[model samples]
Target: RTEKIICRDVARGYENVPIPCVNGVDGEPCPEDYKYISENCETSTMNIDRNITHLQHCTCVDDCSSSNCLCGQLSIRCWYDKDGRLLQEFNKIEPPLIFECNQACSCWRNCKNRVVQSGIKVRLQLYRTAKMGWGVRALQTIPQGTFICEYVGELISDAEADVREDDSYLFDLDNKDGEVYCIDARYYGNISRFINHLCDPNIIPVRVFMLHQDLRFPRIAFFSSRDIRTGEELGFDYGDRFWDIKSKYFTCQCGSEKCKHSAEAIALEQSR
Candidate 1:
């Protein structure tokens, strides 16, 4: 008998994409709360929620390389090369930035600067790990700086996040201000939720804001921090706070020289 496969995009040609559930049936359909849009979605526009406001686009009739182009004026250029390979050295301005062509822009969908908005292009699979339970892996080699996928889920207020007991899948937005929000993927999420933690990670999370001015809830997208080989596990640093809390329940098996063993070890060293 053939094995059953479950995924949001079944046409991606991957195998064994398991949808494990803690409280429900395994391999069942994803929950309705899981709003899994393949591409980026705006939370607000024109100071209104779900108002369907037009995207503020640039009036670039030709290639967006001219001096007057909105992205050009801001010194934002294509991060990819002519052959569609990511540039080894990214020449970006201070404070770091992400500029994507909007719906109003005349640039084609294949425009070089528009990366994260395009969504996942490479093939990935969900595999069972010996120690980490389920984890995500690349079916093909990924180049450095290549756009992967967004860490999306239910956006909830900080108060709701605080009252929750199982925060293992909660990703804090951390807007750098008083506002508090988090992406809870316990019941709903994409492949990003299966990515495990590592002391030395091949993927890096990037904060992106486009078509909207609200910095409080910037989109969380991941990019290849280094060239990743096929069959290699995808992972990112889950921040210091995660170590402080998760260390009590589990130990890291990332096998990196920088591994702190467990969160208890870190706490003991700090107390002394």
Candidate 2:
């Protein structure tokens, strides 16, 4: 028998590549029961509504390369480049809403307007960090503006998510046009769920629409904020109000100089 590189792929695979689970810190075990999925699963409760008919599609004759395409025009700019990396001009702390060309579009499957829909292409590894429990790391150099991965989980009503005891894995979608929803990655999730929060992070979540045109249920896709080096962990800011609702204002241990939870930051607040 031949020795395989990824004989024991932790939970499942992505982009046809096996993802490894390694604990470089201690004996902490990887999530065994976590079901890794590539896309969202609707866990409809309390009549979460959506319009699945006649979603607006693009009519790009040249693979939607130019911003003239209907899909690119939505964001007022071409989202991605020829190599699939998002144009840095589109990268921001709060990126403009992105709507990729759906399966119903006239453009081919490999069009530039269909990025987040193409799924994860970066080589990623899930590992345990000494302070932050589980986290994800890049095995290869990730270029600036590259699409890292999508936050996949069970899409449920925000009503249920708000009251859910554990708020650690809840991602809320604060958009109009339908019943507001949230993604609960507590059970059904992928390696992307392992990504942690940092005071200063190298990634940002971009709301994307692929499956449908409903403005409410956009997929949360994370993209590289800058050129990330190999072996570096991927993270994003959880915003200011993340801790206000939680039981404990867990002191930010992200280790950045601007750590809002640090003693100096507290003293600075007192002086002000």
Candidate 3:
């Protein structure tokens, strides 16, 4: 028998919001060693030593208003409303760029520029899926452009990512402008690990940089592409090249009206 556990402190920076975890068929009990939320990343192998820090705080004269904030000067738009509702225009950019106000900033914790840093706000639940393994879903309506949880894991080298036999849980932190890194969530991860892939998905990954200018290790965060209703399974397009590079295929059970059968099928068709 599987037990459903309410995770109240699974994540950091968020208050009393509780998430339910449902164990899936043949699924191992959630690991106690890994954090349900993201902490600063760690490397698996010692050959490559990269002491990268994700924490970057700004010095603000006051609340991080557009006039006095350093992030705003970089053209990193503010994505939150006065009431903290995410702005709908968030995805207007091809790959949205997010910069959050950090501890170094003189602004108050409620600064409008500090949305994702506040952490997951809406209710989320993990449930067993029929075909694609364990999956996550929204328990409440998520407004369009809302900040979903991040896709976080251990930071590893490109060389390390290449030799791994299984690529299911690896996310490449490449923005196509030459910077690259890989995040492997197999040994340590959060609920975002359970998010499945679809040709057309409601959630989309976006690149975020804070306190650091190094593009190779930009934080990977997800945003709702459109208004996501309650009970809708959360998914993102894992890119067409994902299947080809991994050299494996599984029948996609996304159930979208426009399902592409499998990621390999789409990759195959796109090649021609």
Candidate 4:
């Protein structure tokens, strides 16, 4: 009965590998010639070929092939190509894209902590001239009801959530129950956080609910309220729409003829 070399057997370098079993046998004690990857003895990697007792007895023990490796963690999983090129390192603060693994890791880190990590990609369009904040480009075509992005992260009680909301935020999640929004601390770190606000934004925000009550999940979509141009930055009338109307105070920068100077001022004007 061969014993398994658990992660406890390996050093930190081999922390990624799970416990190894000799001859597919569970709870088997690890043989000699193998070393622990980490301080914990839960797993071990093969040091010598002669030490190989079973397939499960050894775990994958390899260093990052490239200097610029992309990984979800600082210590584990590099974004490796077929050629074994390390694309980049994970940031754990930006959005997750196929290209920038580091940026993607950053986004995953922040979004996971906030409420925006559904682990799915939505049809996002960039506007042309709207690259003011955080390098955001404007959208050319008018997207009436396109899926923005999924909200991910941990769900907490409203009381706990309210404390986390930012003071600069014009809109609060209270208006939309059962929906997710970014917490203040984490929201500032979100990918969308890079997007700036517009006073006369061509796009508008809309929430899509499931037709059936059983479908607990709903999507938030941003549509072009008016015609847009090729080099125009896609923006929605945030804090000016329905929720803003009730809130009675908002500041806008949308340079439109019908632009309401401020959210509250516009609401007053609209009421008049």
Candidate 5:
């Protein structure tokens, strides 16, 4: 036997609190069908309204100054004006090399008397200022005895140097017992190699040599005896006495009023 209970409507957990409710279309309280989730907080956001993005907090300290040029303490500032909007950037500046450093050998003048293979072409020009006052032009040039620029490069043996010139101009220097700086024919393969001979060259080609009387030190620097001007070509007077005059004769074109019929600039030996 079971006892029957009568139906009565009563609040179970909210007897003393206000009841929260949602109204339907009929303005009556109704139960919700879905559960609500927690709010979604974003770490960063792109701000479309401001035309810029909201970035995370940066650890770097800001140090800057206002100037028209790129201005910064340790770096240079770069900016771009795109569509009338200025965007900023920065670059680090590097330190310079130490002073008094020895660099590569390039120009002959800068060689500091230390002869090395010249990698550039040194062109002949007029002598702007007169040194010993015998100014002449380029027409009456001679060969051999006339001095030219000092040939500087790696020192080589006579056999190696003879390959550069024809048999007539080439001579074996190995047995000469003298220190002649020889350039390898391969290294001197350029226009400076064939710079034409001139009678009156502005810069007199000189040979730097040491005399036995000087006790093993370089003592003599030989120059051409004739007057030369700026822009005049250079030539050497290969001694006429050394060549066979009757068979191997050179016609002299030197502008001297007493110019020899032969073009040779060297003087013939005279008998006392």
Candidate 6:
């Protein structure tokens, strides 16, 4: 027998909060060598050789909502509240790219516009799913428009990403950009790597402007598209391109009414 399952903290005390790991379904812990990093780490020559630094900073020692705050001005609108909830509905449409006050800013740490920069503040747990492999869930209620977590991993060049055997976690910064980069999390990643995909999902991806202004390196953040119940599984749409470019199509187990990869959906496409 797979010696009675173990429920342990995966963060091992490195993170601000402890995230418990539960593999009660499989009795296997996340791979020991599979490193966990909450921020991007440069690996390829493209990201490694470039030493770009963002010179922008805000002089607002009180609040970044002021007109002089260059940070909030990066986006078209002020998209945050003091509670760390986004001002707009994230799932309704792709929200505008967000910029937050960074270390260079003179503003207070609790700047309302700096949600993602404050790091994760909610209770998150990593667990295994019967069909979806490893997955993450909210241990506590996640309010709508809440800042979830950033999609982080090894930052690699587009050329380098293409060569990786594992394409599951490769997230392209943007397809049309000339200097496109991809974040590959299959080997080394955070809990976001374990979040599953759904045709209709509660999570929305938002491009974030952190310390760097390099257009190709906008950090990807996951936001709660709607209020999430305790123990609810977290998922996001991987997009049609993900299924189209895969080596082979795997039927989606997302179970959404809008599932685009089911047997009927596959037949409907072939009939076209």
* Superior by TM-score: candidate 1 or candidate 6: 6
Over 47-88, each residue of candidate 4 has an lDDT whose tens digit, in order, gives 212222211111112232333333323223323333222223
* Alpha carbon lDDT of each predicted model: 0.64, 0.77, 0.69, 0.32, 0.25, 0.77
| Cα lDDT tens digits for candidate 6, 157-251 | 87888789889998878633576788999887877888888777998889987666567778898989988999999998888778777515677
Q: Candidates ranked by TM-score, best first?
A: 6, 2, 3, 1, 4, 5
Residue 184, candidate 3: how far off, in angstroms?
A: 0.8
How do the residues 107-213 of candidate 2 rate in per-residue lDDT, one tens digit apiece?
88888888888877888888777788878889999998999988888887867886787777878776955667888887787767789888779998889888776
Error of 6 at 214 (Å): 1.9
Candidate 4: worst 10 consecutive residues by lDDT? Answer: 51-60
Error of 2 at 145 (Å): 0.4
RMSD of each: 5.6, 3.7, 4.5, 22.8, 42.8, 2.8
lDDT of 3 by residue, 16-52 (tens): 3656666545555544555554644675543332223
Candidate 2 vs candidate 3: which has greater TM-score? 2
Relative to the true structure, candidate 6 has a C-alpha RMSD (angstroms) of 2.8
Q: Estimate each model's TM-score.
A: 0.74, 0.89, 0.79, 0.35, 0.28, 0.89
Error of 1 at 181 (Å): 2.0
CA shift at 214, candidate 4, in angstroms? 7.4
Q: Candidate 1, clashing residue pairs?
A: none
The positional error of residue 202 in candidate 2, measured at the CA in angstroms, is: 0.3
Please identify model 1 stretches exceeding 4 Å from their true place.
Answer: 1-56, 65-68, 72-86, 91-95, 176-178, 261-272
Pairs with backbone N, CA or C atoms under 3 Å apart (clashes), candidate 6: none
lDDT of 4: 0.32
On lDDT, the stronger of 2 and 4 is: 2
In candidate 5, position 249 carries an lDDT of 43
